[PDB]
Amino acid sequence: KVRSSVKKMCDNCKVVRRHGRVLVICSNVKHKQRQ
Amino acid sequence: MELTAKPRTPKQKLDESMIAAVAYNKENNVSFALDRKAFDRAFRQQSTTGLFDITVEGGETFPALVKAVQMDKRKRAPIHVDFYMVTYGEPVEVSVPVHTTGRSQGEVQGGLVDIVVHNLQIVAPGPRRIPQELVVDVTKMNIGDHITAGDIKLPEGCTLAADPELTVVSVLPPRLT
Amino acid sequence: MTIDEIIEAIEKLTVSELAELVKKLEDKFGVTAAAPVAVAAAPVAGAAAGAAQEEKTEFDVVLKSFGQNKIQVIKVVREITGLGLKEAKDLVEKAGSPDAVIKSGVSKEEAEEIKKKLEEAGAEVELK
Amino acid sequence: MTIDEIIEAIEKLTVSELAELVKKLEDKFGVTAAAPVAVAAAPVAGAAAGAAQEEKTEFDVVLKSFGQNKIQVIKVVREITGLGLKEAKDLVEKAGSPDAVIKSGVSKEEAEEIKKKLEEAGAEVELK
Amino acid sequence: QIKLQLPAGKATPAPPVGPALGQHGVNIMEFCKRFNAETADKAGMILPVVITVYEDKSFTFIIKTPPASFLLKKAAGIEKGSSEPKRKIVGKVTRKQIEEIAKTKMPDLNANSLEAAMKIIEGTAKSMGIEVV
RNA sequence: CAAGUCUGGGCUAAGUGGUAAAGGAUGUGGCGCCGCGAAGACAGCCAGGAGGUUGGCUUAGAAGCAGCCAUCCUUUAAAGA
């Protein structure tokens, strides 16, 4: 999403690592956090 | 407690684990010692407010401890302290503080609260005789109301090294009154 | 005449001995001055009661399901155990699950009774 | 769905429901964080157990006296309830008093059993 | 299988009792009038009920010592609430009368012990602006 | 393209090295704190997912799960402002 400033939402939105990449995964489309 | 060393060697002690403080007691002063570690633990408990001491060579395991320092520098990490003792029946320079509890008057009803320029008290009750915790709070809090020195209400050891009418604590509008 | 022994006694003391001795000895040190001995004694009683369950010297009337009479049957379950309206209905629905014991800790006679009450009301029941 | 109600439920919950739910809910707030709810629940269980007693859906095997076999019978009572040597003998002697329930809180079968054990051992027993 | 709060002597206020229970599984006029049958013993002071309808689109069931706070109110003598509690805190009330009121509500009220009960009183009172004073 | 692919003890796994700031993020590697595992501890799992709580403005609906004010009591396994 914003590419820069990813910071958790649903009370369980996950900080995961893919390609030295910080993307956040949750169970709501409403989270798709991607830097 | 413990705290040691006392030759003449700053720069390095001022490096590692032993910050330097002066051995100070009316009449005599010997080269600093002690060590940032101990400091930590106890100044931690309560520099210039509680009061213990060290056992260097058993020496003169007496009290007072600090009457001057500054956790100095930039980092907010102290170095170079001032220790003083009083085996005397003269202790006058007495700085310990006093507290309240939150007497619901301005707060728990009007939101209103207080300014405590005070907190701490420097006086001189009974030497080597001061509550490690002095409590004093005739409650009362709201409107453009304020209280200080004078009124104060002091217990036993009758000193008051300070002065009347000044910086105790008052109630002020947290938003309004 | 020793600690571990006292433990042994509280332990063996059937759920009844536990509950009642708890009452008593507390009655010796009140629901305040007291705490340690009879208070844990309670959990003990829990364990013993269970024991009764696993064994057979105490039964569990479980609801297997409701049919064509959920209203009346829920009335029965409610009056029977002393479960608020809402609570009672929730459980009643649960009736089918293993813990579906509409009334646990009932003698042979009383349990047969309970089973009979639900059954009549409009539900199918089963004992232990 | 209300306080007094919860009270009602703990109350009605037969001694077993009390003991066991005490175990459980404690298991929800531990024999420390817990206290209020299942700890009094215990006294409740005491009351209910008693209830069982007064009614008949639970029995009390009482010792009426010992004859020509106090040794062996005391052996029986001791093993039966789990009462230390001394304690066991004292009670055995008491056997004659109303509280002389050698084993309280025993089903029909188990109680008949107890009565039989003491009787054989060398004592006269009676159920509730 | 529904909970509701309602007005003694009354029973079928289109807006608050028609929608809800009616839809959840209730015959609003029936339940309402039986209701009247009930509240007729304590009319004027609001009362609450847990009404269960099971599998015929029917029933009713229980009235349980109305919300402390508001009942207290009724006792005190004041419609709505100041505006905000501990912030508009000014509805001072009394011990005795309080504790008695307790004694009466004891039912759907916590167990059946003075201490706890009256205590619940101060609590609610507070919540509203009713200050045990 | 002249001279240790020296040896010694760490840390890097991004070619950073071969330019960048605020700001991110149980990355990694080293140092201090609060709570316990036999009140046998966090994630697993069983379960009740307590009651006066459904309190005020706005209600037309706060009755945590509109928002502005509370944040008590509790019978009892606790409590969940």
Name the pairing type of β-strands D59-66 and D123-127: antiparallel
Check whether residue D62 and residue D112 sit in a common domain: yes
Check whether residue C44 and residue C68 sit in a common domain: no
Q: Which domain holds residue D36?
A: 1-57
- The integer distance in angstroms from the CA atom of C40 to the C1' atom of F26 is 39
Resolution for this PDB entry, in angstroms: 5.5
What CATH number is given to the structural domain containing C30? 1.20.5.710
Check whether residue C23 and residue C39 sit in a common domain: yes
How many helices and strands (H and E) does chain A possess? 0, 3
Q: Do E52 and C69 touch (CB under 8 A)?
A: no
Cα–Cα distance between B20 and B4 in angstroms, integer?
10
Instruction: List the beta bridge partners of residue B25.
Output: B28
Measured in whole angstroms, the distance separating CA D15 from the mean position of its chain's CA atoms is 11
- Residues of chain C contacting residue D110, judged by C-beta atoms under 8 Å apart: 57
Check whether residue D67 and residue D88 sit in a common domain: yes
Check whether residue C30 and residue C66 sit in a common domain: no
Dig out the tokens for D77 from the structure.
């009572």
Burial of B101 (0-12, 13-18, 19+ CB in 10 A): exposed
- The integer distance in angstroms from the CA atom of C49 to the C1' atom of F66 is 48
A 10 A CB-CB count for B105 gives: 16
How many C-alpha atoms does C26 have within 13 Å on its Cβ side? 23
Question: Which segments of chain E belong to CATH 3.30.1550.10?
Answer: 1-64
Right CATH for E65-133 from 3.30.1490.100, 3.50.50.60, 2.70.70.10, 1.10.10.250: 1.10.10.250
Tell me, yes or no, whether chains E and A touch by having 3 or more C-beta pairs under 8 A: no
Check whether residue C12 and residue C28 sit in a common domain: yes
Cα–Cα distance between E89 and E129 in angstroms, integer?
5
> Which chains, if any, share at least 3 CB pairs under 8 A with chain C?
D, E
Hey, of D3, D6, D8, D44, which one would you mutate to test binding to chain E, going by the most E CBs within 10 A of its CB?
A: D3
Check whether residue C27 and residue C62 sit in a common domain: no
What CATH number is given to the structural domain containing C98? 3.30.1390.10
Question: Which segments of chain E belong to CATH 1.10.10.250?
Answer: 65-133
Right CATH for E1-64 from 3.30.1550.10, 3.20.20.70, 3.40.50.10480, 3.40.50.11540: 3.30.1550.10
Check whether residue D92 and residue D29 sit in a common domain: no
| CA–CA distances in Å: residue D94 to residues D62, D64, D65 | 10, 9, 8
| CA–CA distances in Å: residue C19 to residues B87, C48, D40 | 63, 10, 10
Please tell me the total count of domains within chain D.
2
Please indicate the experimental technique that yielded this structure.
Answer: X-ray
DSSP designation for A29: G
Check whether residue D105 and residue D66 sit in a common domain: yes
Q: Do C85 and E61 touch (CB under 8 A)?
A: yes
**Backbone dihedral region for residue C38 (phi beyond 0: left; psi -120 to 50: alpha; all else: beta):** alpha
